Amino acid sequence: QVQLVESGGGLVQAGGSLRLSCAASGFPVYRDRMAWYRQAPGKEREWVAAIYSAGQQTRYADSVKGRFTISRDNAKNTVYLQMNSLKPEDTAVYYCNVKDVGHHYEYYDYWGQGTQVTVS
Amino acid sequence: NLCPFGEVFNATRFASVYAWNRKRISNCVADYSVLYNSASFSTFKCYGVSPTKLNDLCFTNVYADSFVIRGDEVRQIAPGQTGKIADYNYKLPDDFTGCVIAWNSNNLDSKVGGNYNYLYRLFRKSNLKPFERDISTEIYQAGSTPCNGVEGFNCYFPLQSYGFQPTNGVGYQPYRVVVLSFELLHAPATVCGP
Amino acid sequence: SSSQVQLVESGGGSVQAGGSLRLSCAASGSISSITYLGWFRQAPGKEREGVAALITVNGHTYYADSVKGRFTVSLDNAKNTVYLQMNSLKPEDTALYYCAAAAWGYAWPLHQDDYWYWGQGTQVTVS
């Protein structure tokens, strides 16, 4: 059974930094794609960053392209999102995400609970 | 010169179906019977020729394409097929002369905790041509708007990882597949039987 | 009708649980072109599935898990006849049984939609 748990958000004054963690279980962290998404209050869930096993290894949205770095750790089966130079606009709940295919060629999108990041 | 089929069939590493590998076979003598009579394959289909007459035939060239899919998709590796495998990954010509050889490869490709290393293409602007190979990894634009190199609304990564779990049913299992294509050009035949 | 391979199956009938039967399938035509003999099955209310298979050149056999250890498929080249010995029968084996022959090689599991020369189908009832 597939499981994703986010951790590491919190309260930060502008210019600060955080390291979000996505602990995965039920599947190896080395795989096609693991993504990080954002949902702010009132807005819609926003794709932030992703890591891949084929092609360009990491991709980032334009708004975070110089400040965030995504990485994978196979030992702990975790995916990290280092966020530097934080801004109030980065304030949101952060989720990690994988898409699996099943016995009937159906696709299902897994998510975690999320972690809150608040910047001032 | 005996044809080097062990190099393809016994290769320690196999490609994902989207980046399927190809070797060329020429100027040698192939003993198909030892492959066919081997009891090491669960599928040995042929198109255009009878497998019992292969050692009596000669061809201009042979092509050994090899990859990995799931077992319940081996039926898509055949002419006239449809679906994501045959349309976006590996297409056979309508007039295919050759043979498809497949076997469960949990032997080498089983992984405790899961094996997500094998991938297949999910989206494509058009269908592949017979024996075309698309290995690109650009974001797929499923809408009127450009993707500008990132994911977003109607912008998706084009490859998907097979969830090969030891707990899976017998059809959602890693199968190594080798396609022998027999070239019937108007040229001297360099690959013959004994 | 115009097919170069013709299968005639027989040996069906009814029997009580625990008993045994022996289906036979005799071919005429391009005997040497046949590479693969498969036994299929259709029970009331179910699709036609695969019971057993035999690679002609090899003698190698495959059995579905629902008949593994009870059914035996075998070949007789003297009579050009394949046999399915059904032992330890139970009422869930009640079905129309078919034999089919291929010339394109072999493939397991069996699949109805491959190209096959088909038999007529012989009834088997177990109560």
Residue numbers in the entry:
A (entry chain B): 1 to 120
B (entry chain A): 334 to 527
C (entry chain C): -2 to 124
Task: Please share text taken word for word from the publication where this structure appeared.
The virus exploits its trimeric spike (S) glycoprotein to adsorb to the host cell-surface receptor, angiotensin-converting enzyme 2 (ACE2), resulting in proteolytic processing and conformational changes required for membrane fusion and cell entry. Here, we take advantage of available sequences of five SARS-CoV-2 RBD–directed sybodies: Sb14, Sb15, Sb16, Sb45, and Sb68 (previously designated Sb#14, Sb#15, Sb#16, Sb#45, and Sb#68, respectively). These sybodies effectively inhibit the ACE2–RBD interaction and neutralize viral infectivity, and a bispecific construct, consisting of Sb15 linked to Sb68, blocked ACE2 binding and neutralized both pseudotyped and infectious SARS-CoV-2 viruses. Each of the sybodies represents an immunoglobulin variable-type fold consisting of two β-sheets packed as a β-barrel linked by a disulfide bond.
By exploring the conditions using mixtures of two or three sybodies and the RBD, we obtained crystals and solved the structures of ternary complexes consisting of Sb45–RBD–Sb68 at 2.6 Å resolution and Sb14–RBD–Sb68 at 1.7 Å resolution. The refined models revealed that while Sb14 and Sb45 interact with the ACE2 interface of the RBD, Sb68 binds the RBD at a distinct site. In the ternary complex, Sb45 binds in an identical orientation to that observed in the binary Sb45–RBD structure (RMSD of superposition, 0.491 Å for 1981 atoms), but Sb68 addresses a completely different face of the RBD, similar to that bound by Fab of CR3022 on the RBD of SARS-CoV-2 (25) and by VHH72 on the RBD of SARS-CoV-1 (26). Of particular interest, whereas Sb45 CDR2 and CDR3 span the RBD saddle the distinct contacts of Sb68 to the RBD are through the longer CDR3, with only minor contributions from CDR1 and CDR2. The interface of Sb68 with the RBD is quite different, predominantly exploiting nine CDR3, four CDR2, and one CDR1 residues at the interface. The total BSA captured by Sb45 and Sb68 in the ternary complex is 1650 (1010 plus 640) Å2 and is consistent with the view that a linked bispecific sybody, as described by Walter et al., would exert strong avidity effects. Although Sb68 reveals the smallest BSA with the RBD and binds at a distinct site, it still blocks ACE2 binding. Thus, the ability of Sb68 to impinge on ACE2 interaction with the RBD likely involves the steric clash of the N322- and N546-linked glycans. For paired sybodies, Sb16 and Sb68, or Sb45 and Sb68, superposition was possible without clashes, with two or more RBDs in the up conformation. The ternary structure may also be considered as illustrative of the potential behavior of a bispecific construct linking two nanobodies.
